[PDB]
Design goal:
heterodimer; A: alpha/beta; Dimethylsulfoxide Reductase, domain 2; 4 domains; six-stranded mixed barrel; B: mainly beta; Rieske Iron-sulfur Protein; four-stranded antiparallel beta sheet; three-stranded antiparallel beta sheet; 10 strands; binds ligand MGD; binds FE3-S4 cluster; binds FE2/S2 (inorganic) cluster; binds molybdenum(IV) ion; oxidoreductase; oxidase; arsenite
Chain lengths: 820, 128
């Protein structure tokens, strides 16, 4: 049964907390026990519940509702449903966003284990403490470290993304604290071990990675999905924009926009060693003849694109006038990346006929005279691939020569992971530092994981965990030995321990997480809805998620936790008589997250403002919470061009439409893309072990499963990370669905429940990454590219049968996840 | 919930679904003798199960795939396992496929729908 919201129910806008797509939702809140009527005008949904609703009329299930308990003790019904008018999702909800209501905090629901107060490890367990105590210990340590060791003694691993656990307010808060106040260069990002970018090459070439609109996917003649599984990882972008194009429903838009131009039925090309659910669905919708799955050899992307690039050049299927006027370095790239289709096929394993077909569909001039409009989408298949920097250098050269950026219906873009929401001071260092190694080598007095869980997501994670757990045990023994000490004496005792190999560990999260195994202190954070939060999606569409409820206990917004830390440090120094030190911690006089939005995002590029790097750019000041709220879930695509009362916030649909790029001379820059084969470190495991250890996303599971681990249905579906294996390989190992296998190489060991998948190639596998029961990262190597970007997708190991788990066989379905 | 007779077990052909409505004419369902026992299955071989055929994601009617013994939804490609009490194999739904509880009378060999586990699409409650 479901309780309808009265027609006057409070309604707020909410962007999905999770993926890059950033689907629009509405949140209905009204007193518990108050019920709307079944007649359409009698409920906030305006739907007729007196009789069966027709198909597609609504997305509403019990999991999309809940009853929260506010700080004043009042209980309220809440309902979180997708917004039919949002152009992003057109009313669609993915299985992840659909659970938002179930994952909102309540003392009896899936989120009852949220952190409601600062927690402290004492007496060999966790106990609640107060913010004053927590800050006394936390600021105390950071203060002693700063006075004795300087900033290099303070380590952080922090989110730099958007959506829940990120956002323009939260990244500015943490960044200002980390970089401007503390000034520590010892910081890594949530998904990468150093302070770097996943897109150094494309950016240096003049092309920021989010250069088009989701509508461009509807206007494309051809769509490439490179190292990407869109139906599972960017669901509604794939469903609301990609598929309608393949189904022929966007032809009228193409016709209206482009005169004197043929529009062949849309086609899609996947560059992925693995046959995924996305491939299968694309074939189910457009037919096999319109889908090209270039099932390349793992890590051979650079060879593929160099071959295509060489070929389009030889065929003349390039935009010469464009290359001539808006690019630099074309002739050099033709020489350095030369590779014949036969050589390409030899290296990639992709038939020459298919290589030719892909190029013909994508770059050969249409009968009407125009080059096809081809959108190149890519994600972690090549970002965490064999040399991040080189693959993008190879791919972008292909895109640039074929003018596939700047033309509607095209673009070479990341598909994204989390939403974006970056506003920060510049990184305070001149060198890239691999943080995990420094910690393993014993550097640092205090480490703070903020909005991330590297125990489940770092590359070569087993080495990190063993090291952190060891350095943490040292501080634990010291703290336990000093039971009864004052907070000040305890800070000294802890500091001494870190001078003897110890490491004080703090986690600022929504839950304890695996990090609770090593942490000494944990601070309660708040997610969207418990706070206001701004972020943009894959087409740079910024929206405001509105607060509609109180955070659990004393939890608070990350940008505010940052201010709380900064003010406690400022006050501690004032009391210590150190005026200059106290002064560097001023600037966090904030009462709500909106104050951070004003201090960072809106001051970017303005007179008298500090150096700020913001995705909002220098016109970010035009954005305000009131204007965003008025813009609804459609918000505005950055960068904002202007604002007026009549039209509101006016933005930018696609970048680079004039052929001007983000470089010194305004031209796109071609780069050399040398094919070196796999890295030695990776090749060594491949020469020593049998299976390629592919890894990644599962449609239903969101990241480290921080919420999912508490959901009954998710627990019953995936009680352990799973590994997709070819049936012949399973027969040889004598395992079937639900059996547990050990996976291992020289970097570590892990385990998973066997998932027989006919589509998996023999000698290859796919394992759910970053899980709570079976950590795939333990078998990933320490190899990273020139900017320290890990080849998370490049590892090999052996697999042996451990045993059977009857419960897994009783509850877990092992039927195919490939539709059709 | 009403006690709507669905059929006599003998008339259910192996893996051949039989349509019926429950708990009212606006709620389409199907009963099927899977052929091999499963938990919760009823009948002489404990293999007769029943579900609402409407996808709880957005209401699209699902089709029964006899080869995989699963229910597929053509709208956003969600697939449910008929042998795992409607567990979602892959998809955008947030709940198992609503399952109809069938009482099997050995004496009469009759199958009567007497309840539903889960909430059928498009209604505030199962009984309107
Ligand atoms: N083998 C392998 N490893 C991988 C990858 C892979 O493909 N293969 N991918 C890499 C990639 S792409 C990523 S994105 C990373 C992800 O690595 P992580 O970032 O470590 O994983 P998440 O689950 O995103 O971490 C979010 C954490 O923040 C908490 N949290 C949620 N909301 C909030 C909030 O509002 N505030 C605070 N303070 N905390 C909050 C959650 O409980 C959770 O502990 O993993 C990387 N590692
Ligand atoms: N359901 C769900 N959705 C998510 C997330 C989630 O946790 N769950 N996380 C979000 C985040 S943070 C991210 S980063 C994205 C990830 O988005 P994706 O990158 O699309 O997903 P992945 O599974 O990480 O990897 C994509 C594909 O890369 C392929 N691949 C592996 N090795 C190679 C290689 O050498 N070359 C090529 N070309 N392909 C290769 C894999 O077979 C896989 O199908 O998804 C986002 N959305
Ligand atoms: S935004 Fe959320 S996980 Fe949208 S498809 Fe990604 S309902
Ligand atoms: S209406 Fe069934 S998968 Fe969406
Ligand atoms: Mo990511
Ligand atoms: O990511």
């Amino acid at each position: 049964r479901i309780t309808l919201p009265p027609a006057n129910a409070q309604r707020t806008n909410m962007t999905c907390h999770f993926c890059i797509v950033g689907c629009g939702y509405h949140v209905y809140k009204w007193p518990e026990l108050e019920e709307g009527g079944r007649a359409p005008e009698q409920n906030a949904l305006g739907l007729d519940f007196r009789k069966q609703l027709p198909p597609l009329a609504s997305t509403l299930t019990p999991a999309m509702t809940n009853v929260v308990t506010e700080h004043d003790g009042a209980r309220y019904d809440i309902m979180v449903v997708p917004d039919k008018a949002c152009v992003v999702n057109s009313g669609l909800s993915s299985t992840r966003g659909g659970k938002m209501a179930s994952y909102m905090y309540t003392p009896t629901g899936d989120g009852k284990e949220r952190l409601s107060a600062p927690r402290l490890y004492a007496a060999d367990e966790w106990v609640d403490t107060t913010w004053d105590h927590a800050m006394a210990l936390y600021a105390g340590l950071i203060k002693k470290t700063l006075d004795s060791d300087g900033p290099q003694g303070v380590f952080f691993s922090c989110f730099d993304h958007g959506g829940a656990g990120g956002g323009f307010e939260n990244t500015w808060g943490t960044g200002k604290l980390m970089f401007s106040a503390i000034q520590t260069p010892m910081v890594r990002i949530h998904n990468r071990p150093a302070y770097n970018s996943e897109c150094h090459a494309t950016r240096e070439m003049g092309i920021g990675e989010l250069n088009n609109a989701y509508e461009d996917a509807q206007l494309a003649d051809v769509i490439w999905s490179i190292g990407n599984n869109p139906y599972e990882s960017q669901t509604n972008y794939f469903l609301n924009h990609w598929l309608p194009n393949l189904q022929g429903a966007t032809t009228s838009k193409k016709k209206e926009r482009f005169p004197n131009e043929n529009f062949p039925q849309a086609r899609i090309i996947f560059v992925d060693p693995r046959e995924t659910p996305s491939v299968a669905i694309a074939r189910h919708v457009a037919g096999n003849d319109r889908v090209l799955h270039l099932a390349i050899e793992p890590g051979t992307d650079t060879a593929l694109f160099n071959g295509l690039f060489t070929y389009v050049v030889e065929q003349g299927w390039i935009d010469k006038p464009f290359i001539e006027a808006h690019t630099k370095g074309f002739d050099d790239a033709v020489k350095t990346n030369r590779l014949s289709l036969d050589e390409c096929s030899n290296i990639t394993g992709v038939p020459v006929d298919m290589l030719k077909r892909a190029a013909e569909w994508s770059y050969k001039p249409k009968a009407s005279g125009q080059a096809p409009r081809t959108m190149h989408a890519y994600e972690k298949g090549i970002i965490w691939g064999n040399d991040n920097y080189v693959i993008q250098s190879a791919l972008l050269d292909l895109v640039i020569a074929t003018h596939n950026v700047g033309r509607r219906g095209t673009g070479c873009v990341r598909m994204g992971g989390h939403q974006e929401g970056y506003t920060r001071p510049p990184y305070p260092g001149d060198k890239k530092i691999y943080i995990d190694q420094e910690l393993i080598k014993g550097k640092g007095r205090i480490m703070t994981w903020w909005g991330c869980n590297n125990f489940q997501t770092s590359n070569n994670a087993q080495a990190l965990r063993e090291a952190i757990l060891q350095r943490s045990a040292i501080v634990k023994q010291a703290m336990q030995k000093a039971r009864g000490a004052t907070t000040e004496e305890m800070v000294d005792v802890i500091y001494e321990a870190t001078q003897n190999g110890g490491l004080f560990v703090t986690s600022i999260n929504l839950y304890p997480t695996k990090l609770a195994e090593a942490a000494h202190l944990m601070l309660p954070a708040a997610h969207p809805g418990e706070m206001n939060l701004t972020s943009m999606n894959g087409e740079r569409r910024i929206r405001l998620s509105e607060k509609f409820m109180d955070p659990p206990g004393t939890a608070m917004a990350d940008c505010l936790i940052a201010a709380r830390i900064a003010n406690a440090l400022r006050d501690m120094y004032q009391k210590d008589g150190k005026a200059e030190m106290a002064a560097q911690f001023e600037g966090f006089d904030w009462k709500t997250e909106e104050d951070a939005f004003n201090d960072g995002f809106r001051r970017a590029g303005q007179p008298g403002a500090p150096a700020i790097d913001s995705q909002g750019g220098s016109t970010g000041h035009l954005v305000t919470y009131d204007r965003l709220r008025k813009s609804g879930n459609n918000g505005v695509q950055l960068p904002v061009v202007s604002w007026d009362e009549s039209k509101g916030l006016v933005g930018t649909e696609m970048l680079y439409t004039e052929g001007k790029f983000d470089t010194d001379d305004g031209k796109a820059h071609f780069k050399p893309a040398p094919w070196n084969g796999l890295p030695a470190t990776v090749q060594q495991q491949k020469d020593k072990y049998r299976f390629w250890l592919n890894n990644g996303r599962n449609n239903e599971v969101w990241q480290t499963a921080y919420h999912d681990q508490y959901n009954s249905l998710m627990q019953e579906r995936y009680p352990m990370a799973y590994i997709e294996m070819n049936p012949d390989d399973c027969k040889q190992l004598d395992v079937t669905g639900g059996d547990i296998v050990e996976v291992y190489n020289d970097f570590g060991s892990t385990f998973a429940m066997v998932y027989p998948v006919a589509e998996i190639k023999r000698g290859q596998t796919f394992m759910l990454f970053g899980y709570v029961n079976g950590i795939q990262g333990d078998v990933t190597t320490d190899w990273t590219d020139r900017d320290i970007i890990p080849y998370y997708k490049g590892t090999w190991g052996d697999i042996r049968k451990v045993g059977s788990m009857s419960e897994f066989k009783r509850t877990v379905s092992f039927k195919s996840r490939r539709f059709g | 919930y009403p006690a709507t007779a669905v059929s006599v077990a003998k008339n259910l052909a192996a893996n051949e679904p039989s349509s019926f409505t429950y708990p009212d004419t606006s709620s389409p369902c199907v009963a099927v003798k899977l052929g091999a026992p499963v938990p919760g299955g009823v009948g002489p071989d404990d293999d007769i199960v029943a579900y609402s055929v409407l996808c709880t994601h957005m209401g699209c009617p699902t089709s029964y795939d006899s080869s995989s013994k699963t229910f597929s939804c053509p709208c956003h490609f969600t697939e449910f396992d008929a042998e795992k009490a409607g567990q979602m194999i892959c998809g955008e739904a947030t709940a198992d496929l609503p399952r109809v509880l069938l009482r099997y009378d050995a004496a009469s060999d009759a199958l009567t729908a007497v309840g539903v586990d889960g909430l059928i699409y498009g209604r505030q409650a199962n009984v309107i």
